[PDB]
């Protein structure tokens, strides 16, 4: 019994090719560059996911001291003074509190400063 | 460069661009008008036009000057006896060009030269 490759290879190739949407040029049309681009793209997808965690970390922080200094203290002497205010621990995305309710972020500034005295 | 040269190479050497303009001049005067490439008609004009001013001389000298460019004795007599005397009123406008269509083998605009 002979068992030629037919239908198998086209199906595999077409699944690779379909992963290529708006890939530029022969990235979208030739199988070999499509598959090769996907190897490097693997690298990027995994690394980036882990990194995106750390990137939103950064955006968080960068808003929080901007509001903090608007109230006359930096990030450092703030997220300290909430933690030194101990039970105050809300921590996760204080960014949004600073970015939408300033009546609240002002009270948190007063709390941190009271804790540092 | 050529800041004041007059005339055309017609993608032809010295010997030929004369034997052209002589042969074409012989046909215009033998035919009244001919149809040729627009460029050869632009160069053909002043040569034939001067040549018939030579024939406006009447005398034997002008006849033999015309003969050295036009080697068919009949056309020589036509210009010498028929046309030039007809033009003896005419401060040199002896030729016009119309340009007809554009041909198909080589795509060259062509034109009429007439009297």
């Amino acid at each position: 019994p002979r068992a030629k490759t037919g239908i198998v290879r086209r199906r595999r190739h077409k699944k690779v090719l379909k992963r290529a949407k708006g890939f530029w040029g022969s990235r979208s049309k030739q199988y070999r560059n499509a598959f090769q681009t996907l190897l490097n793209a693997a690298t990027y997808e995994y690394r980036d996911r882990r990194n995106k965690k750390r990137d939103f970390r950064r955006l968080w922080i960068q808003r929080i001291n901007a509001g903090a200094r608007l109230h006359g203290m930096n990030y450092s002497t703030f997220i300290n003074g909430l933690k030194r205010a101990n039970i105050d621990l809300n921590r996760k995305v204080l960014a949004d509190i600073a970015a939408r309710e300033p009546e609240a972020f002002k009270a948190l500034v007063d709390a941190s400063r009271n804790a540092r005295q | 460069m050529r800041h004041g040269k007059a005339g055309r190479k017609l993608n032809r050497n010295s010997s030929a661009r004369v034997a052209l303009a002589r042969a074409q001049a012989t046909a215009l005067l033998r035919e009244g008008r001919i149809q040729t490439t627009l460029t050869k008609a632009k160069e053909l004009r002043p040569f034939v036009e001067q040549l018939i001013t030579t024939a406006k001389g009447g005398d034997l000298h002008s006849r033999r000057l015309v003969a050295q460019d036009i080697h068919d004795k009949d056309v020589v007599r036509k210009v010498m006896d028929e046309v030039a005397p007809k033009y003896a009123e005419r401060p040199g406008g002896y030729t016009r060009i119309l340009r007809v269509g554009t041909r198909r083998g080589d795509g060259v605009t062509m034109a009429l030269i007439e009297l």
Binding site: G25 | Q35, L98, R99, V100, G101, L112
Partner: protein
Amino acid sequence: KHPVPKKKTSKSKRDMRRSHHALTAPNLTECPQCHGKKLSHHICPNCGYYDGRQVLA
């Protein structure tokens, strides 16, 4: 000696050479004497006029 091209040209890059291969439409005009079709400073090919008849057609 013998220069030869280095990579194949991309469809994008070659098509943007050809950005300048557009033919110019003839500027056609209406013969005042014939019916229509005429090219400027030329005879009308149909009727032969260029103020009266010129060429035979």
